[PDB]
Amino acid sequence: VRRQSRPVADGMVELPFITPKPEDELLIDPEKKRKPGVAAPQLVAGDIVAEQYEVLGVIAHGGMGWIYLANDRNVSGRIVVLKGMMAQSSVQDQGTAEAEREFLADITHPGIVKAYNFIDDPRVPGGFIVMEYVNGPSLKDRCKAQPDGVLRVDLAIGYILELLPAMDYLHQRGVVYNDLKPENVIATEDQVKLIDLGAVTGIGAFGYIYGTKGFQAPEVATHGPSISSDIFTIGRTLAALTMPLPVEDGVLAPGIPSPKNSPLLRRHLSFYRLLQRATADDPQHRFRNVSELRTQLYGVLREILAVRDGKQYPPQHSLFSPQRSTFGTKHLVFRTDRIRQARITAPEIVSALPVPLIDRTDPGARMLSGSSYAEPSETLETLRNSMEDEQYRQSIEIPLGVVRALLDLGFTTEARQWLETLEGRIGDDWRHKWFSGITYLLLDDYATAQVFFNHVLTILPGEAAPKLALAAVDELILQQIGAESTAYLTPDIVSATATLSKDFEDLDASAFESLSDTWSHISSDPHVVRFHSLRLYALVWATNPTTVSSAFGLARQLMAENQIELAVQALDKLPQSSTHYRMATLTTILLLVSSNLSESRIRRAARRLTEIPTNEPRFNQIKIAIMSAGLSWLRERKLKASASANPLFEYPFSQKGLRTGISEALRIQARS
Template identity: 40%
Template sequence: MPEHPSGSENIRPTAQSSTLIEDPTDVTYRAPYPWATRRASPAETSPWSSDEDDPLLSEAEPGSERSVRSRPSVRRLSAGLVDLPRVSQVDPATAILRDPEVPEDKRFCWKCQQPVGRSTGDGPGPTSGKCPKCGSPFNFRPLLSPGELVADQYEVQGCLAYGGMGWIFLARDRNVSDRWVVLKGLQNPLDFEAHVVALAERQFLSEMAHPGIVKIFNFVKHRSAEGVPCGYIVMEYVGGQSLKEMLDLRAPERIPVAEAIAYVMEVLPALDYLHSFGLAYNDLKPDNIMVTEDEVKLIDLGAVAARESGGSLYGTLGYQAPEFTSTGPTVASDIHTVGRTLAALTLNMPTERFGPKLPGIPSPDEEPVLRRYPAFRRLLLRATDPDPAQRFPTAYAMYRQLAGVLRAVLAEDTNREYPQTSAVFGSPRGDFGIDTLIRQTDGVIEGVHRAPTLDPPSIVAALPVPLIDSEDPSAELLTPLLHGDPRQTLDTLRQSTADMSAGAIGTPETFELEGALTAVRAYLDLGEVEQAREHLARLLPAYRTDWRIDWYTGIAELSCAEYERAYDHFDRVHSMVPGEIAPLLALAATAELLIQTHEGSDEPDRWRAAATEYYRSVWRNARGVASAAFGLARRLAVDGDVATAVATLQQVPHSSRHHNAARMTACLLLVTKPVTELTQADLDAAAAHLHALPDEPRLLQLQAIVLSAALAWLHRGGQPDPRTTILGFRYTETGLRGGLESVLRAVARATSNRLHRYALIDLANNIRPRSLW
């Protein structure tokens, strides 16, 4: 499969800044086009909450006002979503190593990665020599000394660090205002292959111009005091701290997940920029990400190489992709290093003794961080999947999912809503489960019991549709069909296919996939599931990594009541796009359907936990998705946590068209708990909800239920203040009976069922207050 397959994962953003933002109201765009490749217009994405702008584009704290701050003590990453302490500016001279020596446990052959220069019984290990395995020369001594003038221009000040390809020196540029520069030499100047790498670097590194990548100033040759000729890359000096240094300062603690994601999101545009030139970075790791006062940059371009190139490949074990030595540099291998870097920043990764980090991601049982942030775990697993085809197809695709995961992490940390704009899903097409609980009260009017169960067709109709990339060759033809009449969609597809076959119009190169998926959506909307399945089966062999096939297959299984299969497909979609809300909503609804199917067995325990957690995740992130609020309330109520269920329903915004339904459902939950748990506060709260709904059609039946609960509570031994009232009736036997009688008679007048009317009148006669006449 190609590295950039057609699909909605590759939808591009509107122009965004990838820079650090000191003030959320003062966004400075470092470059007009921080992404190397194309973008989509705002109309191509649909917010889950129509009342909110995308916080990635603009996010301000509640109650904040515009202000001017000259030197803020904190700065913001990811468009203001994450606050971080400012990194202090330091004198570059203080970064020079006093004793530049490579520890023996860090000495490895640059070519075969075998340990070299190690101690033996005869004394300390040699700092230079040849690898006993492959014969490649090694030299761990600095070839330049302080005060030495390189190329008659750069005065060496000392060693800064030892990198993957050799020593890195700090120098002064005596020809340009004595500016600080960095000289990066080759690990083995006598090695021919290393010189070939240096020659290749000269050809493309000088063309790199991105705010997130260190600048290359020059390429020079110099003969050391020992007479050894060597080439050096002259780069800008980037002050601050590397993420590796930050980790060392926090040890044994790791960097918080939100901070780590924010840092990585700052460098992903730089990787995408390199990829657009046909290059791969190859050596992403905490050491090579530098955080300064106001920016995050990739440093050390020594391992950058053309994609799928052969020859000497440079990288770091523990971060490199497993296929790296066989495939060469690819976008997928770079994505792997991003995932490993995120893991190294946030997790205690298992490491070989005196060696690289071991492959794999720890389990949630081993790392509490992964239990707390399950979407983050899924993102790490996809980024580092052993199969390159299963990883994120582009740096931008990973960026978008990281943005969603970041919101989920922040929502978990702060219990605040972080609504998102999806680049790969449209808006939900409707809601489901809104009246699942409250419609039970209709039995008071109709005399018919209504089970509080979900309706599968309403779920299928409500779930969103995956988007088509606006710059996909098929987009102009197919985008108008995504939300149109399904029969008209199929007619248009048939006509277009005929025109293509006749040569009347051209055939877009992606039409086989995109046209088939559009037809699948139409067939599913029509309930013609078998036709949809046939199209999906034909697509699967050639497009097995396209998660939309799993999404539509899950919808098809849901339509046929194959809920466990549907759940498995939605789970795979969640793993492929872990920053999206749509798969979470689908998983929650499917798990609830499975509870209904497996009621009475041991299996529902798994589905109960899943439904509750996924509904909670959706609602915590997007208060505009009312289906999640009602679903979470149902699950909490069943589990006996009525207080939290009611609190959840009270969070439904006043602007929501389901606000009244949320109030009525909260009222119902308050008064239908066991009478032994009922309190006067519950009854009063329920009555308060009804007072706010004077024109609601279900008002009478809810009043009857509340008064009935109050009477039962009184019979149970409740002791209210007799001077208080509920719904206008006193908290006494006579007052509550009289109130319930009048409400039941009003309900009887409203019912159209003659027999049920008689039953209600009989009940009112039985409940009315006793009298002597």
């Protein structure tokens, strides 16, 4: 059943159909490019092994030696692989040694190669594992088939997602794969298969673990294999598929490269964050299981496709609710009201930010269903009498439900103290870090909130909520120091950062001197705070068109960098179908006359206002703001009038004409 390319990851990626090689083109010539030191094959076509396998030839040479292909004489037409198999300790109990091999044979999953036998031929010392022949190229071959030696990042994530069910099948049975790397992942027809069955061991197994240096976790040699060490190899494999990693004597250098030295990671920083967490040095700081990694891969893939292709998908696997409100959308427009500085507030940001979804596995989950609609004073009491029950001693939803009730009652200081009490037991949980960031944000301790929200983003690199929270906290830091009009970045960096395009890749590493090697979000340097707020708003806006708070936030950061043209372009993408469209149109008009005045910007602002119906209540006050800009620009330039005799609105664009026009408009305003 030969087919077409197949959709994976909710249709966000299509994996190609790989046609299997004809069965008369599978064997390799052993004499073609004979490497140094490798001996000739001991077996040749026609040799019978264990009176059941008729050798046909060799298909590869690897660490375990030559890999033979053979007919299985007990299943008509079946071809099998004979591969060198690792011996055991030769001292363990005999039953235990047989039981481990009988467990490899019983493993049954369509994403894992089947093992048929374990034999020892006297012409080949070391014994064979007999396994299914998988007709297809390895993921390593697919990379070498590309001119730059790497797979496109979204395709590589699709392949990783396809092998995760096989990894989880092993993990749930108490065994780990150990040797995941591109060369033992084969893409055949429409499926992805793991082939290195002989490396599978139990979780925490004594003995030499046959991993690969450059992919194996650092604690395996001393502490043994674990589910966390398999997660590590998944991150290393994903890194190897997507970028040319530095190699030291045939071994991949440890660590994930800095985004200062990687165009791919520079363009997709959440992909960088995900690789960091999967390959963290401390196993405690890694994804706990495959499903945990799977959830963030979907969010990171969404941000990859939005940044690169402009494709927007709805969030389907988020750990957060959607946005609950908006913030800062009326910020710039309300300042022109007549009726003393309006500012974006912390409670306004918190009311807009999402809340974590309730975990259904928590025992106290039933106690919290209905906490949003109920009176917070009652919820606090009901959740407190629940903590008097031993069955809820280990609950996390109930104690954090108390925190929310305290924050909903305005008892912010008691909420901070109660979070401190829970630090010892549940401080590691990202939901504790999230509400710690919320609480300190409400206390106006923006530096501490930045630390907690960065911790959340580190744990959940694919989620939009911590990025918007970080972007808002960074904007509040800049607002605290009065930097909403100060520029800190060069026009080249701002232009590249605001669009998240290839220009962000063309910049040299010297442009990011103020950033740490890992582009850490924790900083009080206004240069770094402005860079992160600008970039995070841009990413959220490009990824989620409904999160309009990021569109206005992006325009605000662009305005401070004197990039009015890009700020206008950002808000012009808000569709006419949105209820915030009128606000966005008025905001772009005011952006044109907010700073760095020029005749072109003033005239464009006026012509845009003229497209707005006179029905708009703020029409006249916007018109005054534009005419006031024209007069201010004429006086700063020492110009009597503009070169053109074309009027500004109905008045001459002159110092005398606009003074009259402003006075006339002010009197229409004063009588209203």
